Amino acid sequence: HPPRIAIQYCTQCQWLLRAAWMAQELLSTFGADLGEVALVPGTGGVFRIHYNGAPLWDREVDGGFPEAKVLKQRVRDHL
Amino acid sequence: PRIAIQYCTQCQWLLRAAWMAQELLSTFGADLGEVALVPGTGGVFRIHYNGAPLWDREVDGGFPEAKVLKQRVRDHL
Amino acid sequence: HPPRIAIQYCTQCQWLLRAAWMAQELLSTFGADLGEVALVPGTGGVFRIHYNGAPLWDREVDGGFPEAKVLKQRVRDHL
Amino acid sequence: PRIAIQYCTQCQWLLRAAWMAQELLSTFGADLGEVALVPGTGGVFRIHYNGAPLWDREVDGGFPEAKVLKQRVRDHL
Numbered sequence: 001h002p003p004r005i006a007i008q009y010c011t012q013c014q015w016l017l018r019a020a021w022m023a024q025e026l027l028s029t030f031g032a033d034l035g036e037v038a039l040v041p042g043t044g045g046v047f048r049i050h051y052n053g054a055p056l057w058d059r060e061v062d063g064g065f066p067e068a069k070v071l072k073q074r075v076r077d078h079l
Numbered sequence: 080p081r082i083a084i085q086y087c088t089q090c091q092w093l094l095r096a097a098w099m100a101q102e103l104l105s106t107f108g109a110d111l112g113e114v115a116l117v118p119g120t121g122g123v124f125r126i127h128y129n130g131a132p133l134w135d136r137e138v139d140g141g142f143p144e145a146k147v148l149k150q151r152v153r154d155h156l
Numbered sequence: 157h158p159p160r161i162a163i164q165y166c167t168q169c170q171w172l173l174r175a176a177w178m179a180q181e182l183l184s185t186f187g188a189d190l191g192e193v194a195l196v197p198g199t200g201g202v203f204r205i206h207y208n209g210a211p212l213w214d215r216e217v218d219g220g221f222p223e224a225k226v227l228k229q230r231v232r233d234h235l
Numbered sequence: 236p237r238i239a240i241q242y243c244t245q246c247q248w249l250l251r252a253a254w255m256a257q258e259l260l261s262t263f264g265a266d267l268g269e270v271a272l273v274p275g276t277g278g279v280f281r282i283h284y285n286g287a288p289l290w291d292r293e294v295d296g297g298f299p300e301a302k303v304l305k306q307r308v309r310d311h312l
Contacts, residue, residue, distance in 0.1 A: 011108050020101045021254035031088050031118055038115040039100055041108055098177035167264050176257045187244050187274055194271040195256055197264055
């Protein structure tokens with residue numbers, strides 16, 4: 001089963017742009033190796049990325065937002 | 080409510096797929112559960128609303144205008 | 157001199173997303189054959205695309221917005 | 236006010252360049268004259284504000300955070 005990557009972002013914070021950018025960085029790099037990348041509207045200060053439910057990134061844990069380079073490496077780890 | 084956009088990967092339709100995804104999320108925001116970008120094969124470009132068909136290059140022909148896409152989604156909320 | 161493509165869009169209409177999408181479609185297709193693609197904030201109902209100042213597209217003339225396929229062909233005409 | 240973002244074409248940095256462009260235009264809107272996406276060569280990623288340097292991978296190191304980019308632009312308005 002190809003992996004489902006989910007990017008949950010705070011809607012009111014206007015983090016849609018950065019979420020959509022990262023989604024494209026992953027899909028342009030991994031292409032069909034990924035089942036999909038979902039952009040999921042979320043609440044206050046939220047910004048999390050999961051790989052089949054497994055934690056990949058969370059602003060609350062890693063702090064701030066992921067650099068494209070790091071995000072790609074972390075997904076590579078799981079893929 | 081899950082919106083899914085399946086696009087032909089080799090056709091480099093990711094760009095237009097992610098554009099549409101943002102047009103929907105920026106417009107409907109949290110009224111949408113999510114918008115999934117789903118890599119696909121040759122000439123594919125489909126959009127589903129909870130599994131229901133909203134757009135298909137083969138049926139509707141071509142690609143949707145942001146205005147049309149928004150209206151169809153709005154019609155299903 | 158590489159060509160300057162300018163995309164002027166109505167700011168309050170929220171047409172930035174479509175302008176930025178088209179800019180990427182052109183730069184991903186023509187790459188360095190283009191000097192640049194500028195996103196230019198504009199006023200009410202405006203959406204125009206120029207190629208070195210020359211008209212390429214204008215909502216007021218062509219009506220509506222350009223399909224990626226058409227925009228690419230029109231730029232190809234000039235390039 | 237002209238903001239220019241020059242990026243390495245072959246590095247496929249167009250995506251991050253266009254992302255930043257939108258972050259600036261969606262934030263500052265008409266206060267900006269324009270944001271130009273300028274194809275470049277090997278490892279280049281520079282951002283100028285009317286010719287003045289705002290960012291350079293070689294100087295600042297890496298790529299800017301949306302928050303940092305917005306602050307520097309804000310500082311020059």
